A = this chain, B = another copy of it.
Amino acid sequence: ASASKAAAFAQGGSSDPVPMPGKYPVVFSTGAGEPTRDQEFALPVHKAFPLFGSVSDKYRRNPRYAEFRAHSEFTDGVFGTHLAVSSLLRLAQQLVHAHVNMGLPLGDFAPLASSDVRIPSALASVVNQFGEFSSPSIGTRFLLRDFEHAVSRVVFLADQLWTNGNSHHIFARSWLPMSNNDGNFKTIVASRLLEFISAGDLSILPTVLEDAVLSGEVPEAWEQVKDLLGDAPGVGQVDRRDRFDFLFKSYADVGQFTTAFTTQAASDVLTELGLPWNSPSAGHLNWQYSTKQRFTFLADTWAKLSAAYSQFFELSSGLATRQSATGSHAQMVDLTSVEGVTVLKAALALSAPEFSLAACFPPSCIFVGGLTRRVVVTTSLSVSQRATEFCQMDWR
């Protein structure tokens, strides 16, 4: 039994993204108590009341309480100023959290990450953009805005939600992760991906080469829209930015953004109505007006959601710091439904939660990072020394 300088070390390192899906729509369809008969129905509207019941917890009290702060990421109170709680967290939150708690195993080697200075910012926006204007745009539109990886303030993890599209079509091509930073940059489209990682892999996945007919209708525009996302949204607001983005996310570009984008309506309706600032300007004012109002609406949780005093099922979010928020492989979705329901889980998640955590959640599009830094300085046992020793037990 050869030993030589052993140890045992634990680590963490990997990526992590998030998306606004029709998933929420399945959790807010009103199946938790719409059929409940306790006569609570005392002259009240219960349309938005349910949908907006999870927001204020799934982003500050639940996830950002342990995940964020404990992730060794020096947090600024002005992103958690109102570390308030919401008891309306029916059965979806303490559940949701466990459903979407960012913290991969150590027995493996992965973690969470993708701008929590931009994600929440937009999320809070959505909470306001959605839970304020159109409380249920019927999948089409609101889901769009959400999934559309809506306009950014230069950061936005969009680039990844968009990369899901250009890699899906290019079967013959696989790309170097360098295509992930494809988000912003004036050259991302005039160099690497679009030209090289396109005139090479794109000149194959769709080699139209059309004459006097302009080849854009053949996924050269996806590169263009890509081009746009490269130079035309980072140049500021100029309102047309929407117009452009919208143009690139609408006007003819419909055949472009239909490989991994939503309905234009959520762009002219939402986006245009919202006003380009409803993602950067909104976020801020949604964090320091809407987050404060988040209370006026949290009141909706601790006054409106509090009025649910008698039904007796609600009582979530008692702790934090101690309850933690990381350790559920709700990552690599890998779910398929056919006659029966099969849930393939790339990462050896669990067995008690797995099958239980299929009722709704199955977290974002992580960009896994096979990393087990088992480093080892050799200023004590120059491999030869060991070998020299072990060898001294193979001579006699």
Contact = CB atoms under 8 A, between A and B. Distances in A.
A385 B72 contact: yes
A338 B341 contact: no
A310 to B, nearest CB: 10
Task: Work out how many copies of this chain go into the complex.
Answer: 4
A76 B35 contact: yes
A11 B380 contact: yes
B35 A359 contact: no
Contacts of A358: 4, 381, 383, 386-387
Contacts of A74: 31, 35, 388, 391-392
Interface residues of A, number: 108
B351 A9 contact: yes
Interface in A321-378: 332, 334, 337-349, 351-356, 358-359, 370-378
A274 to B, nearest CB: 28
A173 interface: yes
A307 interface: no
B76 A390 contact: no
Contacts of A381: 358
A359 B4 contact: yes
Contacts of A201: 173, 200-201
A78 B345 CA distance: 38
B376 A355 contact: yes
Given A200-B204, A373-B380, A396-B312, A359 B77 contact: no
Contact of A344 (B35, B353, B372): B372
Nearest to A92: B394
Contacts of A341: 376-378, 382-383
B383 A373 contact: no
A344 B375 contact: yes
A313 B395 contact: yes
Interface of A: 1-13, 31-39, 72-81, 90-92, 95, 98, 107-109, 171-176, 178, 192, 196-197, 199-201, 203-204, 311-314, 332, 334, 337-349, 351-356, 358-359, 370-383, 385-396
Given A74-B392, A340-B379, 20 more contacts: A7-B355, A31-B74, A32-B394, A37-B78, A74-B391, A171-B176, A172-B178, A201-B201, A312-B396, A313-B393, A340-B377, A342-B375, A342-B376, A343-B376, A345-B370, A347-B372, A354-B374, A358-B381, A359-B390, A371-B379
21 contacts: A31-B387, A34-B76, A35-B75, A37-B76, A72-B385, A91-B391, A107-B107, A109-B346, A197-B204, A200-B204, A311-B396, A313-B393, A332-B370, A344-B371, A345-B370, A346-B371, A349-B372, A349-B374, A358-B386, A358-B387, A371-B379
